[PDB]
Design a protein around this nucleic acid. Structure first.
Ligand SMILES: [Mg+2]
Ligand SMILES: [Mg+2]
Ligand SMILES: [Mg+2]
Ligand SMILES: [Mg+2]
Ligand SMILES: [Mg+2]
Ligand SMILES: [Mg+2]
Ligand SMILES: [Mg+2]
Ligand SMILES: [Mg+2]
Ligand SMILES: [Mg+2]
Ligand SMILES: [Mg+2]
Ligand SMILES: [Mg+2]
Ligand SMILES: [Mg+2]
Ligand SMILES: [Mg+2]
Ligand SMILES: [Mg+2]
Ligand SMILES: [Mg+2]
Ligand SMILES: [Mg+2]
Ligand SMILES: [Mg+2]
Ligand SMILES: [Mg+2]
Ligand SMILES: [Mg+2]
Ligand SMILES: [Mg+2]
Ligand SMILES: [Mg+2]
Ligand SMILES: [Mg+2]
Ligand SMILES: [Mg+2]
Ligand SMILES: [Mg+2]
Ligand SMILES: [Mg+2]
Ligand SMILES: [Mg+2]
Ligand SMILES: [Mg+2]
Ligand SMILES: [Mg+2]
Ligand SMILES: [Mg+2]
Ligand SMILES: [Mg+2]
Lengths: 363, 114, 123
RNA sequence: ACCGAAACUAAUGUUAGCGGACCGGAGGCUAUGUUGGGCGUGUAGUGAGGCGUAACAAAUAGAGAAUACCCGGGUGAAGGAACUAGGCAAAAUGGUGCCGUAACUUCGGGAGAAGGCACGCUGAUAUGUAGGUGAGGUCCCUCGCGGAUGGAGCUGAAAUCAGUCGAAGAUACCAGCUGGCUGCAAACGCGGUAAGUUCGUAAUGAUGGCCAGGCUGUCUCCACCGGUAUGGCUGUUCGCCAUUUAAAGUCGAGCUGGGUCGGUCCUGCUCCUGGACGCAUCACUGGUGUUCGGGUUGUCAUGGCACUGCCCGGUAGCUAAAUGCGGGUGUGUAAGCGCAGCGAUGCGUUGAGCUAACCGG
């Protein structure tokens, strides 16, 4: 399974070019095992300085970078959340994902014409959020119908579930977001399985002109809303990302130096989606390959190893986990052994980001 | 007094719609920021109406962002731009203060279908 | 209308869950604090891994009161509970990074424009 | 042993609580109630009663002989013990059923621990069920105040499902506050707070101390019917401490009674508008509003009574927390009639009826 952030948004905002250039960033699956490309399943790789910095010392034969997964949520009409077939399909396509990336056109363009005719991030954002809010209203009303009769039966767990649902309901009736509520961790636990749509974190993908990265009223409104909802933003230019997709390495370097961009905004979307879900990556060092491995934050060494192979979990005994600072500054594994910066990590320690590790199992 | 009646009458709004306790209403009020002036919408259940001519007021209760908010509008003040009844509720009290104890399911008000 | 010993819920993500007003700042014998007033608070309940600890003493700005605020036209806005936003004891800036629930325009002073910008809804 | 009818606290000068345990408790039988329409004999068990000379229930509702009906209280915005020696007093809890119940333990307890859910009415199951009672008739009979059968009639829970009304169904009265630590005494065995002057032993205690949840007019601060801190500790003055501030400068024929374990009395702040105090007012926001309207429990005859029975609202007035310096109002669709429904009830008439102190005549 992949940690997935569905790309949603209104039509004629520049999302099409955006995920086209995102797919163009994807690697050909002819060399990566188990990688199957559905036309809308966008599996994109990690431009990672850490892994090549490791490879500068470990010097592996190949490199296996980790990748994330994206869903293009295409096809949208107003009023879709009343249970229409296309509305159900849109809602289901969002449901199976883990986070939401909402795209907002933030650049003036008379050749890109919208249904409103007026460029306004606020009302477009409000429209799509109201759609998802009505969907979650339907889901939530079904939920209280299911749970109130159980809680009347004395079930304390269903009681707490009922309290959380009753606090959620007026937000959805008010077409409001569940992320705007002060919900504690156990309330999140209680209503995690209902998979509330507005509850998942969102990243505001603001499509803007090349020269409009600043001094932009549309960016101003997007930033304001993202601050209010505690969501993050990422400013991108469809033309710039499309060119980066259309250019090979040296001409891409030339173009990024032309525009004064230290690193492209597609990398920013990658990092936003990656860090939004509270997940990290560690590194395994080898002569065959140094591989970056993606786990949720807090997953143990046995659990991360089982994510590799179940024998590495069940038989796990100990791991030699090295912090990346002590790994780099002492120039590789042998320098680490000479400095003694290793960790004989057992099963209970929580994996930290980027730690160079070696896994020992017994099956 | 006739004097105060005349003074108040020449100030009263003419287009105040009919609404009753239990009605969900949306009250469009004026918010003045810097110099610009815009409409802000407060939609909620009318839980109380005070009828005193120019001094008529009504209380609207909503659950905004998981927090109960009651706003008491002065019916004839210019700050209240408009009132629109979005739903007619069927209650029997004149003052629905008991909704201050209600949450979600118990807070539904039957629709006055007539 | 908050006084000493009044227990307020917390309207930000700073980790405090309930705080108690131990002082109404800004005047000798000052009885009460309404919306927009700085109070001195102790923290009675906090989430275990929050930015603030149980028993810390710091400041807060009252943002919602049951007693409510009056508007120049005679309107009153009342909330179901008293809520405050925790403030750094010295800089008097918010300690949390998000604000929960509505606030009122009486906060719209240069002192608290951060809270206004982060608030879900300003009444 | 437990809860609860028939001298621990406070106020007043008995009342409300408390410990042990307009009044109208001032198997068979029977009294008696509800509903319907002495002698003789010698019975259940010497011996009630019955019989001779209608049934049922059984020694209004309720378990009941409780209870209700036949300065002293009420309410209170926001806060919620900041009061104080001390939560004193008040507020609160409060029933039944089911679920659930920790440490510890002398294995009984703790325990009603704590905590959670349901509760009205109507209909159906079932034209009144399970159960109780038990006529006639039938049969038997050592033949009677007998036995068996039989179920008429009477009484009758409790439960489920469905419906339905209110804000609220243990609706009134009645009716545990709960939890944590600890001293002492029963037999028995051998850190907390922002701030804190405060030999064991289960159970028990109107016992001493401390803490917490709830609750609250105890208090901020009471309302209605020139300036010159607040708190924790302590009896403290003081003092330290927490946090403020411009600053915290150097009286018991008024109250209390802690001391002497228990024990009679004006200016801040911001930029280049606030705090505190005082006066006035009620237009606004509200409180009160036992004189207005409504809901509802029990009972008695729409009304009385039950704290205004309990409540929900609320006019005027008063008021602070508020702000200056015929109609109207309130309540919320009366009654009656009609319709739907088996019925509770809903709907129409109908925003009806009623409407105090208000306004205009
Ligand atoms: Mg006894
Ligand atoms: Mg005595
Ligand atoms: Mg005396
Ligand atoms: Mg007595
Ligand atoms: Mg006893
Ligand atoms: Mg007793
Ligand atoms: Mg008799
Ligand atoms: Mg009596
Ligand atoms: Mg009282
Ligand atoms: Mg009060
Ligand atoms: Mg109150
Ligand atoms: Mg409280
Ligand atoms: Mg004290
Ligand atoms: Mg004191
Ligand atoms: Mg007492
Ligand atoms: Mg009492
Ligand atoms: Mg001692
Ligand atoms: Mg004793
Ligand atoms: Mg204390
Ligand atoms: Mg100490
Ligand atoms: Mg005083
Ligand atoms: Mg004394
Ligand atoms: Mg005296
Ligand atoms: Mg008046
Ligand atoms: Mg009032
Ligand atoms: Mg009253
Ligand atoms: Mg009488
Ligand atoms: Mg009376
Ligand atoms: Mg009487
Ligand atoms: Mg009537």
């Amino acid at each position: 399974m992949g940690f997935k952030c569905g790309i949603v948004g209104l039509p004629n905002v520049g999302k099409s070019t955006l995920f086209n250039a995102l797919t163009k960033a994807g690697i050909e699956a002819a060399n990566f095992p188990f990688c199957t490309i559905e036309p809308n399943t966008g599996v994109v790789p990690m431009p990672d300085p850490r892994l090549d910095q490791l490879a500068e010392i470990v010097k592996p034969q190949r490199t296996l970078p980790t990748t994330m997964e994206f869903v293009d949520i295409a096809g949208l009409v107003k009023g879709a959340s009343k249970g229409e077939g296309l509305g159900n399909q849109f809602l289901t396509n969002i449901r199976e994902t883990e986070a939401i990336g909402h795209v907002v056109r933030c650049f003036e363009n008379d050749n890109i014409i919208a249904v409103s005719g007026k460029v306004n991030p606020a009302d477009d954002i409000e429209v799509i959020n109201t759609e998802l809010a009505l969907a979650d209203l339907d889901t939530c009303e079904r939920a209280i119908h299911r749970v109130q009769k159980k809680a009347k039966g004395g079930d304390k767990d269903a009681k707490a579930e009922l309290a959380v649902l009753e606090k959620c309901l007026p937000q959805l009736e008010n077409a409001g977001m569940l992320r705007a509520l002060d919900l504690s961790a156990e309330e999140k636990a209680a209503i995690r399985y209902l998979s509330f749509l507005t509850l998942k974190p969102t990243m505001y993908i603001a499509n803007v002109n090349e020269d409009g990265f600043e001094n932009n009223p549309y960016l101003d409104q997007v930033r304001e809303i993202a601050a209010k909802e505690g969501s993050v933003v990422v400013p991108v230019c469809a033309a710039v990302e499309a060119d980066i997709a259309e250019l090979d390495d040296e001409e891409r370097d030339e173009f990024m130096q032309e525009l004064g961009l230290e690193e492209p905004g597609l990398n920013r979307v990658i990092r936003a989606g990656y860090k939004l879900l509270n997940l990290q990556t560690y590194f395994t060092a080898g002569v065959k390959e140094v591989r970056a491995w993606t786990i949720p934050v807090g997953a143990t060494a046995p659990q991360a190893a089982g994510k590799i192979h179940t024998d590495f979990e069940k038989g796990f005994i100990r791991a030699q986990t090295i912090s990346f600072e002590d790994f780099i500054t002492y120039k590789g594994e042998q320098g680490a052994k000479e400095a003694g910066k290793m960790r004989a990590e057992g099963k209970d320690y929580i994996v930290k980001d980027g730690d160079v590790m070696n896994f020992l199992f017994n099956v | 007094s006739n004097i105060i009646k005349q003074l108040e009458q020449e100030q009263m709004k003419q287009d105040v719609p009919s609404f009753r306790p239990g009605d969900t209403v949306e009250v469009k009020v004026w918010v003045v920021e810097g110099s610009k002036k815009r409409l802000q919408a407060f939609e909620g259940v009318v839980i109380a109406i005070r009828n005193r001519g120019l001094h008529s007021a009504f209380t609207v209760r909503k659950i905004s962002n998981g927090e109960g908010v009651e706003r008491v509008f002065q019916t004839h003040s210019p700050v209240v731009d408009s009132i629109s009844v979005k739903r007619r509720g069927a209650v029997r009290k004149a003052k629905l203060y008991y909704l201050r104890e209600r949450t979600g399911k118990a807070a539904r008000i039957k629709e006055r279908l007539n | 209308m908050i006084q000493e010993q009044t227990m307020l819920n917390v309207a930000d993500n700073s980790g405090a869950r309930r705080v108690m007003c131990i002082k109404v700042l800004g005047g000798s014998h000052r009885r009460y604090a309404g919306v927009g007033d700085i109070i001195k608070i102790t923290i009675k309940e906090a989430i275990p891994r929050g930015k603030v600890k149980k028993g810390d003493v710091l400041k807060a700005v009252v943002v919602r009161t049951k007693k409510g605020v009056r508007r120049p036209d005679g309107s009153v806005i009342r909330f179901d509970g008293n809520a405050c936003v925790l403030l750094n004891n010295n800089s008097e800036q918010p300690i949390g990074t998000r604000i929960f629930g509505p606030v009122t325009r009486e906060l719209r002073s240069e002192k608290f424009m951060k809270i206004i910008s982060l608030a879900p809804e300003v009444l």
